[PDB]
Design a protein around this motif. Structure first.
Motif, PDB file in Angstrom:
ATOM      1  N   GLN I   7     -10.156  39.598  11.566  1.00 38.22           N
ATOM      2  CA  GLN I   7     -10.446  39.110  10.357  1.00 38.22           C
ATOM      3  C   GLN I   7      -9.274  39.208   9.440  1.00 38.22           C
ATOM      4  N   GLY I   8      -9.268  38.359   8.343  1.00 36.99           N
ATOM      5  CA  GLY I   8      -8.246  38.126   7.895  1.00 36.99           C
ATOM      6  C   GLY I   8      -8.152  38.679   6.139  1.00 36.99           C
ATOM      7  N   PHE I  10      -5.793  39.536   3.831  1.00 38.21           N
ATOM      8  CA  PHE I  10      -4.485  38.738   4.095  1.00 38.21           C
ATOM      9  C   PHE I  10      -3.709  38.873   2.888  1.00 38.21           C
ATOM     10  N   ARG I  56      -0.631  39.039  12.638  1.00 38.36           N
ATOM     11  CA  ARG I  56       0.040  38.007  11.588  1.00 38.36           C
ATOM     12  C   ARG I  56       0.680  38.324  10.383  1.00 38.36           C
ATOM     13  N   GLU I  59      -2.027  40.604   7.385  1.00 36.61           N
ATOM     14  CA  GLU I  59      -3.210  41.369   7.335  1.00 36.61           C
ATOM     15  C   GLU I  59      -2.612  43.003   7.582  1.00 36.61           C
TER      16      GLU I  59
END
Ligand SMILES: [Mg+2]
Ligand SMILES: [Mg+2]
Ligand SMILES: [Mg+2]
Ligand SMILES: [Mg+2]
Ligand SMILES: [Mg+2]
Ligand SMILES: [Mg+2]
Ligand SMILES: [Mg+2]
Ligand SMILES: [Mg+2]
Ligand SMILES: [Mg+2]
Ligand SMILES: [Mg+2]
Ligand SMILES: [Mg+2]
Ligand SMILES: [Mg+2]
Ligand SMILES: [Mg+2]
Ligand SMILES: [Mg+2]
Ligand SMILES: [Mg+2]
Ligand SMILES: [Mg+2]
Ligand SMILES: [Mg+2]
Ligand SMILES: [Mg+2]
Lengths: 141, 56, 56, 61, 107, 63, 206, 141, 145, 69
Positions: I7-8, I10, I56, I59
């Motif tokens: 899940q992001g 972010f 990524r 995150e």
RNA sequence: UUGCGAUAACGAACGAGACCUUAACCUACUAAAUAGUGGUGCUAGCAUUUGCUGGUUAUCCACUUCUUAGAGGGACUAUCGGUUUCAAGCCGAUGGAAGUUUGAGGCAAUAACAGGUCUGUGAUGCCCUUAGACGUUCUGGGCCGCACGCGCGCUACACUGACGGAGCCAGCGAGUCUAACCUUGGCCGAGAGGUCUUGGUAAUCUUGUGAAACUCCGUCGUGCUGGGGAUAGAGCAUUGUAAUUAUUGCUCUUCAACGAGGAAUUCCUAGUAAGCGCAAGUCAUCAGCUUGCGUUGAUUACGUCCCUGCCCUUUGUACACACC
């Protein structure tokens, strides 16, 4: 009905046999994982990186099973590939010989390979039994 | 040279051969080099029978 | 004498080609035409094809 | 690319001249009796000679 | 000195095949009349020694090459021979141009 | 566009400057034995069926 | 019409291919009837094959390549631009994936679509250089049916190779989009666009 | 003893030796079934000797194939030859000739290399190029 | 031995070790923006710092950033095996230092002006702007350098 | 440019609009949704488990997927 | 200039061809533990109830299909159609291992060129030098020096792709005591490599050269990006008396142009082009090179004189050191 490890596909056997020794956990993964590349011709270390030594030992012990003796030097030549020398053309470079020697000494202590007076490692009484069980598991899973 | 070459060509033919050829190249009182073949008989130039039959 | 057959045949081909040119030079005025070397145990004998044998 | 030399065609024509009530329209017996009635130095040479000679009879009929 | 098998092998190496298989035939013909049991002329693969040189002595012209080839043919004949009569009939008439070696073994 | 399929009767010979054009004699499939001569760019053979977008033009390049 | 038991057991989907030979195991070579003649004997259907790999000699005579199958001839026009020379295993893998995508959209027969492509982007009128210099004239020639097949395989596979280059879209689906557009006749395919360029030139070069 | 024939198949350098003898449907390649061949998209080459005639003609027969030489595609085209030639030679020596000549009809009417070795051979490289025909690029300038 | 989701939570473009390390690209390939830290060096320290490699890089929690940089600035503490670094047996104190973002230019200058200062031939070739590693200058580098 | 994280408003039209896709692939989600391939791959393996798309090929480097029923 | 045919020529010779070598066939012969296959003399394992194995040839026997190499056979466009002057031939079909000179080479006439090589030779004439040498040898430098023009290439511009894992398959060589060559195995090391042993003078051991592209499964996701690896810094080894101007390899870092290329230009017609790598040569070390070798294997034509080059005939000539 008596299944050998030739009736099962090599990709599906080694994935099943790697996850066995991972979930069993007696292989003494040597400590220098995540710093090593497995060959000088490689760019990167192995991309799974929690693993890959269970997969290398599953491919070695299968390779000992198929063959009659394999040693370290034959194992390096096996897992080498094309080395990008940058601007000069590619070449075959043998793989890392401390990884494959510590695969073989690992499979010895868990009883898969032994000393084999015609060379390097032959697969054991028990090791042939161990891979044959997983081969029986893999066809009907 | 003409007495030497026809001396050895017609010695070869009178000793029983199918062909003979003497080629002399160099310089003899003239600066510019020339070559002259003294050929009498019958020769074969192409193929394996060069190796079978011809002494060079 | 512990030498490979690729090497021992070539070395005997060189010993032949050396004596061919040696006897070309030394036996020039006695009508040398060829040498023939026969590799036998306990002796090798050198056969000289010289036309005027009587001064060789 | 399959034109035959005079040495095939002379020897074929010299076979027809003196061995017509012999060798027939079959190549295989023509191949085999050129071993006896001619001295030909090669197997490849004999088969070209025997084949044009076979071609000649099929034209003669 | 009395008719005992010695397990001898004669290996025959030579550049030229007609003179080589002349002696490899005569080794067969000699041991088929003393009634000796033999593994015959085993025809090893022909060694082809190739040498590639430029044609020209200097460096001029088109890039033209020779391949000078030496062919080595080799045979061996295994024998089990009464030694004194067979060594009598083998050491005689050694062939030039054919190299012959005689090896005994303890097997 | 009223195209017509035509059926090769004879390969009359190569034409064009480079030889890549082959001149053929065709008869039309519809109203057969209405026979003309055309030029062909690709490898044409006997009894090939090829299509014409015009009905009144005969090939003019030869030799 | 029965399953057979052997000591090395054979699966049932391949056992069903005993009754009919299909492309890879899935699409029949029957009902691939070509609506446009003059390309029959040059589109090679009516001889079924299993996979589009054959080590057959078809370039030693003038017209033996008209007997190579039309799916092998499509695989053949993929493995080029140097880096893909050799590698028919990759080109056969593409067409297996390609004929899937051709089956998913416009759900009809995927062999029939690639056959409908060849009969639609074959250049029927082309032109040639008459006159042996740069300042010359151009003449309208008709086109051989072997060439219409020859160029159509070239035009579709180049338009696949261009469209798959430098983007996320794969060679499997650009070719599949190439062949589906060419099957309809839409002017949105490379091969139809290049064909009408060849034919409008020959309308004016008469 | 057993009714047994032994044939071979041949691509460029790949020579597949088949030992066909009477049995129970066994079709094995080097130790392993016909179901797992690698390349797995060329699986149907080594299924064409089976599917053109039907599996029922292999049900009384054990086939044990060893292939070496060549490469991955090249060995595959020798497997499909070694067992299509093995089945026909078994239908010569043991089964009827009319039944042998249905095998040689449907094999040849599909793929002539199923029974007859392709004569395309590696033409030697010539000096002045990297290839047999192709030459080095010349300059003029 | 299976595939898990994510899940992001972010965070975008992020300063790190005096470099605008990027979001929207993965962790060992966002840290290659930092000079002195390449791919092998990112991959080893994003495993020594117990970081998931599929995160990524945006995150990433802000404490996970701090363990990443603490390992980079100090590698011989945390079992990076001293053959893995830029500067080993350094030039003047003998100790292995992995040189980082603005310092790799700084130690490059410190190498080049150490070398001219003794009038060493490679420093002279570095001063003249020629190739210094024994090339052939006759043909190559003939629109720049 | 391409969404490499998955927030909710892309998620609720991944689950709403991959239905009515005939063909689904990695690049099909990249060029018609607006995610990257590394999330299109995740949105392939998730969506077959939910069964709103069914596999056809499942090759690495090329996945052919289609709408259920 | 291969023949057919026309024929003031007829009948021949050299060259082409034939020949020699190599590759493709031989379930026909001659066999072989320096090649295999099959039982099993005889074992001995794993799952089982026969599948996959590992082992011994006066501690077995048999066979030669596979391999090898002796001696042979085969193809001669065979047969049949079409065309041709019913020729020489050519094309198609069928058969066939092979129907492109069966593929490919080796050989290759007469005449030459002011082609190159005196720096390959103890091939050589003449000339120059011959001790303050242009001899020979020793130490160090140079051939590699870098505003630049040109040639052959190597690495790329990526998704038909890079990486990681896994699958994993050739062929041509070469190799040491007439001394340190090819190196298996074990151990130490991320790697390079080190050390203790071994087999091999080689169908025996390296070596099944477990070669690379390739295949599958993952990670990337159109971003000069994880493409590209140029330049450059730091350390560790190897060879060598000696590595500086980096010999080469190794590990980290730096990450340049390059988004498929004006004008032009090269090679190429089937296991051929191209992609891929392996051995050999030179070699103590160094291959982006060449000679081979195998793996993968297409597009396009079976034509023409349009461009270029060459050949022949006719015409012209005041040219014959022959348009230099
Ligand atoms: Mg070792
Ligand atoms: Mg390198
Ligand atoms: Mg004469
Ligand atoms: Mg002659
Ligand atoms: Mg000739
Ligand atoms: Mg013309
Ligand atoms: Mg090539
Ligand atoms: Mg045999
Ligand atoms: Mg001159
Ligand atoms: Mg001159
Ligand atoms: Mg001196
Ligand atoms: Mg120089
Ligand atoms: Mg050049
Ligand atoms: Mg890969
Ligand atoms: Mg091999
Ligand atoms: Mg980059
Ligand atoms: Mg050097
Ligand atoms: Mg070398």
């Amino acid at each position: 009905p008596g299944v050998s490890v030739r009736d099962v596909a090599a990709q599906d056997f080694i994935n099943a046999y790697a996850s066995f020794l991972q979930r069993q956990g007696k292989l003494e993964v040597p400590g220098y994982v995540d710093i090593v590349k497995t060959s000088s011709g490689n760019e990167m270390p192995p991309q799974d990186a929690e693993g890959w030594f269970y997969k290398r030992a599953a491919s070695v012990a299968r390779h000992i099973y198929m063959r009659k003796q394999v040693g370290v030097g034959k194992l390096n030549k096996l897992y080498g590939g094309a080395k990008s020398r940058g601007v000069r053309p590619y070449k075959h470079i043998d793989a890392s010989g401390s990884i494959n020697r510590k695969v073989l000494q690992a499979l010895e202590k868990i009883g898969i390979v032994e000393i084999s007076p015609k060379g390097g490692r032959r697969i054991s009484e028990n090791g042939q039994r161990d891979l044959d069980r997983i081969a029986a598991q893999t066809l009907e899973e | 040279i003409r007495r030497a070459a026809y001396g050895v060509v017609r010695y070869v033919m009178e000793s029983g051969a199918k062909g003979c050829e003497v080629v002399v190249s160099g310089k003899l009182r003239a600066a510019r080099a020339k070559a002259m073949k003294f050929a009498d008989g019958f020769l074969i130039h192409s193929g394996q029978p060069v190796n079978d039959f011809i002494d060079t | 004498a512990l030498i490979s057959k690729k090497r021992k045949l070539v070395a005997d081909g060189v010993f032949y080609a050396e004596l061919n040119e040696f006897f070309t030079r030394e036996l020039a005025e006695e009508g040398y035409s060829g040498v023939e070397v026969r590799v036998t145990p306990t002796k090798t004998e050198v056969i000289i094809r010289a036309t005027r044998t009587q001064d060789v | 690319g399959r034109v035959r030399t005079k040495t095939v065609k002379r020897a074929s024509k010299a076979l027809i001249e003196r061995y017509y009530p012999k060798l027939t329209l079959d190549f295989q017996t023509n191949k085999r009796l050129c071993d006896e009635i001619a001295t030909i130095q090669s197997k490849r040479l004999r088969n070209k000679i025997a084949g044009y000679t076979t071609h000649l009879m099929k034209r003669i009929q | 000195q009395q008719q005992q098998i010695i397990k001898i092998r004669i290996t025959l190496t030579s550049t030229k095949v007609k003179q080589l298989e002349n002696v490899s035939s005569n080794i067969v013909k000699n041991a088929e009349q003393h009634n000796l049991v033999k593994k015959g002329p085993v025809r090893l693969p022909t060694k082809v020694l190739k040498i590639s040189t430029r044609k020209t002595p200097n460096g001029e012209g088109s890039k033209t090459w020779e391949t000078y080839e030496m062919r080595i043919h080799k045979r061996y004949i295994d024998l089990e021979a009464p030694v004194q009569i067979v060594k009598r009939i083998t050491q005689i008439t050694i062939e030039p141009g054919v190299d012959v070696e005689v090896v005994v073994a303890s097997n | 566009t009223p195209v017509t399929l035509a059926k090769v009767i004879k390969v009359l010979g190569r034409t064009g400057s480079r030889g890549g054009v082959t001149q053929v004699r065709v008869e039309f499939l519809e109203d057969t034995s209405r026979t003309i001569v055309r030029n062909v760019k690709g490898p044409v053979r006997e009894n090939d069926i090829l299509v014409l977008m015009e009905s009144e033009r005969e090939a003019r390049r030869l030799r | 019409f029965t399953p057979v038991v052997l000591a090395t057991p054979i699966p049932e989907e391949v056992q069903q291919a005993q009754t009919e030979i299909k492309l890879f195991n899935k699409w029949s070579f029957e009902e691939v009837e070509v609506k446009d003649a003059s390309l029959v004997d040059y589109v090679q259907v009516r001889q079924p094959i299993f996979v589009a790999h054959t080590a057959g000699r078809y370039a030693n005579k003038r017209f033996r390549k008209a007997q190579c199958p039309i799916i092998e001839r499509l695989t053949n026009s993929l493995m080029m631009n140097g880096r893909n020379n050799g590698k028919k295993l990759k080109a056969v893998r593409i067409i297996k994936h390609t004929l899937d995508i051709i089956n998913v959209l416009t759900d009809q027969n995927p062999i029939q679509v690639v056959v409908d492509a060849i009969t639609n982007t074959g250049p029927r009128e082309d032109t040639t250089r008459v006159g042996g210099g740069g300042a010359a004239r151009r003449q309208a020639v008709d086109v051989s049916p072997l060439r219409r097949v020859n160029q159509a395989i070239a035009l579709l596979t180049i338009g696949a190779r261009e469209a798959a280059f430098r983007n996320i879209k794969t060679i499997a689906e650009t070719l599949a989009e190439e062949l589906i557009n060419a099957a309809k006749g839409s002017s949105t395919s490379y091969a139809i666009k290049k064909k009408d360029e060849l034919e409008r030139v020959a309308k004016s070069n008469r | 003893a057993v009714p047994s024939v032994q044939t071979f198949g041949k691509k460029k350098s790949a020579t597949a030796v088949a030992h066909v003898k009477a049995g129970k449907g066994l079709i094995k390649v080097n130790g392993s079934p016909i179901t797992l061949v690698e390349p797995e998209i060329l699986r149907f080459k080594v299924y064409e000797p089976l599917l053109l005639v039907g599996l029922d003609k292999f049900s009384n027969i054990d086939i044990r194939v060893r292939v070496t030489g060549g490469g991955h595609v090249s060995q595959v085209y020798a497997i499909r030859q070694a067992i299509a030639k093995g089945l026909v030679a078994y239908h010569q020596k043991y089964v009827d000739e009319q039944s042998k000549n249905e095998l040689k009809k449907a094999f040849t009417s599909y793929d002539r290399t199923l029974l007859i070795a392709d004569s395309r051979r590696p033409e030697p490289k010539k000096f002045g190029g990297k290839g047999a025909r192709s030459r080095f690029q010349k300059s003029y300038r | 031995s299976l595939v898990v989701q994510e899940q992001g939570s972010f965070q975008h473009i992020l300063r790190l070790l005096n470099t605008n390390v990027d979001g929207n690209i993965k962790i060992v390939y966002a840290l290659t923006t930092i000079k002195g830290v390449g791919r092998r060096y990112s991959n080893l320290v994003c495993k020594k710092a117990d970081v998931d490699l599929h995160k990524r890089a945006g995150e990433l929690t802000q404490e996970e950033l701090e363990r990443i940089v603490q390992i980079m600035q100090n590698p011989t503490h945390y079992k990076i095996p001293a053959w893995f670094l830029n500067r080993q047996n350094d030039i003047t104190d003998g100790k292995d230092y992995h040189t980082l973002a603005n310092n790799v230019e700084s130690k490059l200058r410190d190498d080049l002006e150490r070398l001219k200062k003794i009038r060493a031939h490679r420093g002279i070739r570095h001063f003249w702007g020629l190739r210094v590693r024994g090339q052939h200058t006759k043909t190559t580098g003939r629109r720049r350098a | 440019q391409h969404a490499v994280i998955l927030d909710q408003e892309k998620y609720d039209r991944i689950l709403k609009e991959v239905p009515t896709y005939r063909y689904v692939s990695v690049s099909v989600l990249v060029d018609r949704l607006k995610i990257g391939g590394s999330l299109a791959r995740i949105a392939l393996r998730h969506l077959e488990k939910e069964g709103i798309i069914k596999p056809i090929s499942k090759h690495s480097k090329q996945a052919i997927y289609t709408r259920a029923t």
